[PDB]
Design a protein around this ligand. Structure first.
Ligand SMILES: Cc1cn([C@H]2C[C@H](O)[C@@H](COP(=O)(O)OP(=O)(O)OP(=O)(O)O)O2)c(=O)[nH]c1=O
Ligand SMILES: [Ca+2]
Ligand SMILES: [Ca+2]
Ligand SMILES: [Ca+2]
Ligand code: NA
Ligand code: NA
Ligand code: NA
Ligand code: NA
Length: 898
DNA sequence: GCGGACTGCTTACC
């Protein structure tokens, strides 16, 4: 097999690489790499090197990386560009791996670990590491084993060994329910003192040195804790064994620390999750995320974690092992490790650089160019500067019965490709008319020869640009995975339907690839399967969809980030002319098709001057279809699904071709390199046939709800609410309020006003019995100190911050009580007037029960009246006025009767 | 007292 790197670092004039050789063994080499950089040279000096602008360069080879760096400074001291890749390990990788890297993930050592530290004096600061590490569990992907390091003897208590027998038993048996599928994978090691544990851990580490190192908060807690504890016990030299090149770097933010372990690639799972999951969670405790991602139960114990080792060491160790397994389970579902390796090897970068789309693209573009013997420009300093973005129509707040939406495929990247926007394809400029002159096809055709954006920029149509070229490569990967996702999703609905009439029999899940639409043979079998087998198939489908979602949405993110990066001053190819070329063209494309679409519908409906498009944001249009439906008459339809089929067809056969024509003309108008504005139907929405449901409503920009029957070719088994912007979607809204508000909306859109009012009456009556956590608001807790004045709210102190201060006063002098962490999230509750806390709200760390010290008092004093009116009624009022309906029966003349 | 204009902060939508 082809070789592939695992890790690369630069240490002085040396490149240290770990790699898998052609016989699949892991090696390590130190290479005294001799890099090249480039200077512009006279045109008379023949060469094979040119900058992206076609100017010739001479290659300078250096004796070592140090001389290359010093020459860069000198060149600045002179005032001349020093071209080429200045990140030498990216050059090294490019030289060394001059081909499409095919990697074998089974050859890559992925380690997942988690440590426990009993601390009586609150949270154990990693920079200090005052307290013994009393457990480590460390899963090795090569061995497929959980290595458990259990401290039996500590100044905080001596305990008996953990029992694997008991670990495996059900909780109802007094066991820990350590998943049976890992019991035989546990390698348990007890120790009679910390020193021996740590030294054994290190010796283990040498033998099985991680390439990818992950876990949950491992970068901000586990790694710096382990590093410093070993450092403070055995000394710096021993601590450095954690690095396969015995080099570490302490990066400090005082007094926190991030340790950099040379030769290892740390991908903290919490950071992968935040960047790639596309969620915003009220809490990021592994407990909370596990329950959310896997539907497993919150782990239970009877005391504070601070005493868990002492009172139930058996459970303490089982829970440490489980914590490690939960991340593996989340990754098996979400697959962010795979994504990282994929992306990393594609760009040819340090795997941890997947967190930086700028580095990722610098690398991809560098390799693409190096390929053609081209030379990349030197990075330059630029001041930060604002610039305009998308257009968003101002909707008329109202209900809207029948709606179909359309959306442009990969919008900004398609503009990049269509127009041919790249640093080196710029041709010149033209004098711009006002934007609406272009939108209205009234302005003078910008250019006859070059491809144009209405911001004034022209680009060459002939030449290929490296930006369009490389963004197209990733776009095509995105498109492949999205197909798998959507097919898996369609399969899913097939399975959900057949689950309505399951055969009462015994059988097994069919062996099928859910990435592709089921064959008619598969469907026939399906409709003969047991419920058991069907539910298992449905699980596998949904898992295939998630896997597809991760792969597609994150390649989407990467290419949109290339768009973004053109407007970041740290990007080698920063250029506000290209950034604006894109967003301005987009503003045009949208408002142009609003016109064409409006024109086309008035026509085929024989109408004149009616506004079909009621909304659009960036690149989408939401079309009111009341009149399309009305031209046929509702009575012409057997059932809901009937007219849904109707609009699917109508949109497919009539509308899209018109839009196709509409954009082809725009392409012509701008003389663009290639027509790539592909706008397909998105959602079909409307009330159930015969129902009094209102179908949909908008409250304003970015705030709407629709009752959807078909989404991008997925015909749902039951209608799905698509709600955007409203409080049901926001992590800051209490859980029970979200659920309640969503049910009000479901009722409005599906059933009608009378339903809504019934539900509201009931909610109002019973809502005081809801668990406090479910009615707590959530907020991020930033700049607590900024607003802390002697324990009390400084000027302009935000509501949630006030609540934190209320908390800190209430727990003052309880070293043990949970502290609110700067930057992390808090639950917030309002308190009734005259409460013992001396303020109107109180806040505590999200994801947690409020400390027993004050919990009872908080519950007594919660302000249910404010909670309800402020978090539930106000939003509800907003929705219903928008839609023209009442959530309470107004007082009327009829009141005078019985 | 407190509405309305502004501001900081938060978290959506693309
Ligand atoms: C979601 C998102 C969009 N955008 C911009 C660029 C997107 O092309 C444009 C439209 O947003 P989207 O329509 O949501 O995404 P998309 O058009 O790029 O790809 P697709 O619709 O096929 O799933 O908004 C960003 O810049 N950053 C983002 O995170
Ligand atoms: Ca001993
Ligand atoms: Ca789009
Ligand atoms: Ca059946
Ligand atoms: Na159980
Ligand atoms: Na869109
Ligand atoms: Na689409
Ligand atoms: Na199409």
């Amino acid at each position: 097999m082809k070789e592939f790197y695992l890790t690369v670092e630069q240490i002085g004039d040396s490149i240290f690489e770990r790699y898998i050789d052609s016989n699949g063994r892991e090696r390590t080499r130190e290479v005294e790499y001799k890099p090249s950089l480039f200077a512009h040279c006279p045109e008379s000096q023949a060469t094979k090197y040119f900058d992206i602008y076609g100017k010739p360069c001479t290659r300078k080879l250096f004796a070592n990386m140090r001389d290359a760096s010093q020459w860069i400074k000198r060149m600045e001291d002179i005032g001349l560009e020093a071209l080429g890749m200045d990140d030498f390990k990216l050059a090294y990788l490019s030289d060394t791996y001059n081909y499409e890297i095919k990697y074998d993930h089974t050859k890559i050592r992925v380690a997942n670990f988690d440590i426990e530290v009993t601390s009586p004096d609150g949270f154990p600061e990693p920079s200090q590491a005052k307290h013994p590490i009393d457990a480590i569990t460390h899963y090795d992907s090569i061995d497929d084993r959980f290595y458990v390091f259990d401290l039996l003897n500590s100044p905080y208590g001596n305990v008996e060994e953990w029992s694997i027998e008991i670990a495996a038993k059900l909780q109802e048996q007094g066991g820990d329910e350590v998943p049976s599928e890992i019991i035989d994978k546990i390698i348990y090691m007890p120790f009679d003192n910390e020193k021996e544990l740590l030294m054994e851990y290190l010796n283990f580490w040498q033998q099985k040195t991680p390439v990818i190192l992950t876990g949950w908060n491992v970068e901000s807690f586990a790694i710096p804790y382990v590093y410093n504890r070993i450092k403070n016990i055995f000394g710096e030299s021993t601590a450095k064994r954690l690095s396969p090149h015995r080099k570490t770097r302490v990066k400090v933010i005082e007094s926190r620390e991030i340790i950099t372990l040379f030769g290892i690639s740390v991908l903290d799972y919490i950071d992968l999750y935040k960047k790639f999951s596309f969620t915003n969670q009220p809490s990021y405790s592994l407990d909370y995320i596990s329950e959310f991602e896997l539907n497993v139960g919150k782990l239970k114990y009877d005391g504070p974690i601070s005493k868990l080792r002492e009172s139930n060491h058996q459970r303490y160790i089982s829970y440490n092992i489980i914590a490690v397994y939960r991340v593996l389970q989340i990754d098996a579902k979400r697959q962010f490790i795979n994504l990282s390796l994929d992306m990393g090897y594609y760009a040819k970068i340090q795997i941890q650089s997947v967190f930086s789309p700028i580095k990722t693209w610098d690398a991809i573009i560098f390799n693409s160019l190096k390929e053609q013997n081209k030379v990349i420009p030197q990075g330059r300093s630029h001041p930060v500067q604002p610039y305009p973005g998308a257009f968003v129509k101002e909707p008329i707040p109202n209900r809207y019965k029948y709606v179909m939406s359309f959306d442009l495929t990969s919008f900004y990247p398609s503009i990049i490709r269509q127009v041919n926007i790249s640093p080196e394809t710029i041709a010149g400029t033209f004098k711009v008319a006002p934007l609406h002159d272009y939108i209205n096809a009234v302005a003078e055709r910008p250019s006859d020869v070059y491809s144009c954006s209405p911001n004034g920029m022209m680009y060459y149509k002939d030449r290929d640009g490296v930006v369009p070229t490389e963004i197209t490569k990733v776009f095509n990967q995105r498109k492949e995975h999205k197909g798998y996702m959507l097919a898996a999703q369609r399969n899913g609905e097939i399975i959900k339907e057949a689950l309505h009439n399951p055969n009462l029999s015994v059988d097994e899940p069919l062996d099928v690839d859910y990435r592709f639409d089921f064959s008619d043979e598969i469907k026939e079998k399906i409709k003969k399967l047991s419920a058991k087998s069907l539910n298992e198939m449905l699980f596998r489908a949904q898992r295939t969809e998630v896997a597809g979602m991760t792969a597609q949405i994150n390649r989407k993110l990467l290419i949109n980030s290339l768009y973004g990066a053109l407007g970041n001053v740290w990007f080698r190819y920063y250029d506000l002319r290209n950034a604006t070329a894109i967003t301005t063209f987009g503003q045009m494309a949208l408002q142009w098709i609003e016109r064409k679409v409006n024109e086309y519908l008035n026509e085929v409906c024989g109408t004149e001057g009616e506004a079909f498009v009621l909304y659009g944001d960036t690149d989408s249009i939401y079309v009111s279809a009341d009149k399309i439906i009305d031209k046929v008459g509702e009575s012409k339809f057997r059932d809901t699904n009937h007219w849904v089929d109707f609009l699917d067809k109508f949109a497919r056969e009539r509308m899209e071709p018109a839009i196709d024509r509409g954009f082809r003309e725009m392409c012509e108008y701008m003389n663009n390199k290639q027509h790539l504005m592909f706008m397909d139907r998105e959602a079909i929405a409307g009330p159930p046939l015969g129902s009094k449901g209102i179908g949909g409503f908008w409250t304003g920009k970015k705030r709407y709800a629709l009752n959807v029957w078909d989404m991008e070719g997925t015909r749902y088994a039951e209608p799905k609410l698509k709600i955007m912007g409203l409080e049901t979607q926001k992590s800051s809204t209490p859980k029970a309020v979200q659920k309640a508000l969503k049910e009000c909306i479901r009722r409005m859109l599906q059933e009608g006003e009378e339903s809504l009012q019934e539900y509201f009456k009931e909610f109002e009556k019973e809502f005081r019995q809801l668990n406090y956590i479910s009615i707590a608001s959530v907020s991020s807790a930033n700049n607590i100190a900024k607003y802390d004045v002697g324990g009390f709210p400084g000027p302009k102190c935000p509501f949630h911050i006030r609540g934190i201060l209320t908390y800190n006063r209430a727990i003052k002098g309880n070293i043990d009580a949970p502290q609110v962490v700067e930057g992390e999230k808090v639950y917030v509750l309002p308190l009734r007037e005259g409460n013992p806390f001396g303020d109107k709200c109180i806040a505590w760390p999200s994801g947690t029960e409020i400390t027993d010290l004050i919990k009872d008092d908080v519950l007594h004093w919660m302000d249910y009246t404010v909670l309800l009116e402020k978090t539930f009624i106000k939003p509800l009022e907003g929705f219903t006025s928008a839609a023209k309906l009442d959530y309470e029966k107004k007082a009327s003349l009829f009141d005078m009767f019985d």
